[PDB]
Amino acid sequence: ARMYSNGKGQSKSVTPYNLTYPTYIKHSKEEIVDVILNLARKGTPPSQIGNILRDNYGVGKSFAVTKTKILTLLKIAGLKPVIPEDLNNIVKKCVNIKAHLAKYTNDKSSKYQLIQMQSCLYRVARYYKSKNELPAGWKPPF
Amino acid sequence: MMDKLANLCITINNANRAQKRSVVIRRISKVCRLFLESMQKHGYITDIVYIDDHREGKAVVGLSGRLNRCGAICPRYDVELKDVERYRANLLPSRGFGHLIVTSSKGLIDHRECIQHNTGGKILGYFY
Amino acid sequence: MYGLLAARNLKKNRHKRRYADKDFAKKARGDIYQNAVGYSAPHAKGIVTEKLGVEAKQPNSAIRKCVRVHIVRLNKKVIAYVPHDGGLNQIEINDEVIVEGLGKKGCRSKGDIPGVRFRVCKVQKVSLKALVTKKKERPA
Amino acid sequence: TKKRSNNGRSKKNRGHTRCVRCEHCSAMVPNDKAIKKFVVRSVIDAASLDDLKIATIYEEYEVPKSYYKLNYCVSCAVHIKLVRVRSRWERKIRKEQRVSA
RNA sequence: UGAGUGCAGGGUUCUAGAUCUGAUACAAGUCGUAACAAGGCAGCUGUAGGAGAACCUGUAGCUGGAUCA
RNA sequence: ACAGCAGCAGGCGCGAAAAUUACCGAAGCCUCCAAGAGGGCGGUAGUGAAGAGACGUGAAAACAAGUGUGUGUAAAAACCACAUGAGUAACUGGAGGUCAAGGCUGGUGCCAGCAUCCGCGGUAAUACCAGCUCCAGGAGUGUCUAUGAUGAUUGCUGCGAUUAAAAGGUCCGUAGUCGAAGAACAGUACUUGUUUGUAAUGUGGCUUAUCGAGAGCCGAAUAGAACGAGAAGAGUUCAGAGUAAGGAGCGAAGGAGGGCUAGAUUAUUGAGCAGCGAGAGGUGAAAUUUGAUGACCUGCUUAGGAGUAACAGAGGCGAAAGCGCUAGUCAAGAACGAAUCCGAUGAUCAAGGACGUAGGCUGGAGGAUCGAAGACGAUUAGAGACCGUAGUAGUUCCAGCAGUAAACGAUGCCUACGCUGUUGUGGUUAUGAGCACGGCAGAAGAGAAAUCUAGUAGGGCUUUGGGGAGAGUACGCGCGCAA
């Protein structure tokens, strides 16, 4: 089940059985690889890179053509971010809640949501600072 | 998450009680395969197919009329060859028939083979 | 607590559970040496100081014959029962008596006698059964 | 022992509900438990409609009705005989009552 | 190296004490009758006042209710 | 001046509790300068129903225990051999049920007594006190006290927690215990071989004292350690692998979920003014009470502070406590659709932290309605109560403290396996159906039943009960302004 609440949803998307090569498409390998690195330098998250490749350029799951994963390609090109993108999105939501509570101090429901959010940050931090993906003395922006 | 060897047992026990002849079992591990293959050698189950679904794994099996009950033991206790008959007398209905399965350096073996090979091991499960 | 490497947790839990048993608790945590007859001694010597009688509990209707004893080993004074038909007549003030338990698990009242916990066994070194049935005589 | 499967009230999947006040004694009772009664009563009694037909100035007239929903606590509903005690098998039967006039 | 012994303190276990206050047993004493039937104001849980005494009254809750409607 | 029996005998005390101020150039050992000397160490008997063997108390013809010789020993006694006399030898607890065995005869009349427990006796006692017959074990049988079993009433094997005793008010969270599939790898646990490691006791045997305990000889052995071996489970790693494991993100939509800003239709009270001219209120029935200083009722004006009727439900939302007028605004969450991204990030939780109806407390704002306390009127033997009149703290808001509820579906949280019909709510749809959250009615199993959040089961983790009472009380400690 869900980690912070009583949810038991089941909405996911199916991974294919085999992957082949997308011969119906209208670009070369080298063009697709160029499209990714452009979208990266403009500052898009890698989950959004995937959405665009599927929706506009017509490639499912973005790996059948490249034999390599999106984040690994960005490390080969040297475009790696300073913080992993998951930990980064958790710090953003915390900041937002603290900026709301700063002006609407009375909101007990928002107070409740903040302590849940903050717990999740530290649990994710401890993962990354074991795999050597963050400096040992990293601390939140707060 | 449930233990995979426990899940296997409850799935076949309930279906047998409901008088079904075949079932699909949904999460499979290496020792689950070896357990089922043991029940086939002693003629408790008849036909086995394994589905390679890339999501864990699953099996389809045909039950015989000879199977009354099976079960897993948790945890998997360590036993000397001196100890196994104690567990045999606790689990099985009669001195004449049924099988207690033990894991060893020589694979899965039954309580008779333990005497032949001169080896203890870890207790895994039983059927009769 | 049923894991294979859980022995320490399991042991500490199960030990703590036993204090719910009255028997284990009293031996561990009560005053087991407060009594004239009990854990300490099977019999007790003492001197008779007063003669006494008590009513039986309902629904019975009787006067039971009892004796006030000063116990040599503790300097407590206790009530004891005198068993036999004419038994009270075999005892004088300032006699020495030996005293015995009623046979329950803890020191508890037996039958219809309220609050009395011991009985007389011998008077002046001789069996009370022999005195009452006139098989033997007082030392004099 | 437990006398009714629904605890005598219609609350499910909720913590708490609004209270209402009894028509007969003003006691507080939870809305999901209160005995309810509907009334549709003519302003003019049946024994006067034959006089109304000669009293009115209009060519035809429709009498105005008055509408009410009433609420009762258990004690009042039993005492006023809106409901009655029933046998162990009858207790389970559920049927809508008539609108009063 | 040190036995013994001065003087202050602590740590333990027992024991005295004017007087006050619990509990238990009281064949059957005195005053009421609070609960068990709609027990004669349906009962019970929390909280706050009050009162010879059981208890009574406000406020929120529960049915183990006298209603599965 | 001398002296220290937890050496051997012995005495006094203390207790419910324990032997002779005995013989010893012999047996087993130790000590010396020794073909010898020493030893209360050790051996021999005496005393005692702590324990353990074998046998007497007659047979149908014909029976212990005595005695004398020899033996035996260091000297003895007992034991054994032969020979003499003979004719001796049972008690303890019971007889209503459990529990084997008498309604037998005489006394006693809720007395005297008996009875582990249940129970007997008030003049017809199979239960008391005795006589007589039976029963049980028998050189033994009763009682008291500790303990093991009884007992699955301590539960690893193996108990319980809807109503009998028993799931923390809700979340977060550390220590602790527990943790995918696929392909490979390594040997410290794990299991096993060989070798060590046990005198007595115990275990499997055989041999000699008339027999039986006894004595003598044999064989194997626990835990612990030394060196090898096997690799299923456990462990470590990898990525042309991507959970009906989790987190991040995208698209369209739904809800009394929460904070803030600005508005609203009535209603209940209070004042002003106008009309009218005698009662209004309240109850089962009435009295307190209010009205010619004009009530009540009907108009028009105003002033406040609460609340959101009907629609409205076995409907919805929230972690729980809880949430119902209309617009605008601010954050985050649940579910659904689908070829998005990362890759074990996870389950449960002592300590520690955050929320928690109502009533209560500290300070400010305010004050319509309702109303603890207090005061009256009735009713009653008495009402201090129930009913009526009136009336204060509180009831509302902001900033905090507090920490309890029949905080209940009296049913912990994850995760499984499971029959049918019907009815809802929100998305999606090959229009056949699904996914999440519910209600209802049977069935089969289950259970002491009632009934079923209770079916099946050695899955994981925490809380928790052990006949009533005393007691959720005393002492100590921690929080709180107090309660």
Ligand SMILES: [K+]
């Ligand atoms: K999600």
Ligand SMILES: [K+]
């Ligand atoms: K959790």
Ligand SMILES: [K+]
């Ligand atoms: K939560």
Ligand SMILES: [K+]
């Ligand atoms: K959860």
Ligand SMILES: [K+]
């Ligand atoms: K009795």
Ligand SMILES: [K+]
């Ligand atoms: K509630």
Ligand SMILES: [K+]
């Ligand atoms: K109802």
Ligand SMILES: [K+]
């Ligand atoms: K009452």
Ligand SMILES: [K+]
């Ligand atoms: K000495």
Ligand SMILES: [K+]
């Ligand atoms: K001595």
Ligand SMILES: [K+]
């Ligand atoms: K003795």
Ligand SMILES: [K+]
């Ligand atoms: K002898």
Ligand SMILES: [K+]
């Ligand atoms: K006898």
Ligand SMILES: [K+]
């Ligand atoms: K007799």
Ligand SMILES: [K+]
């Ligand atoms: K008689």
Ligand SMILES: [K+]
């Ligand atoms: K017990």
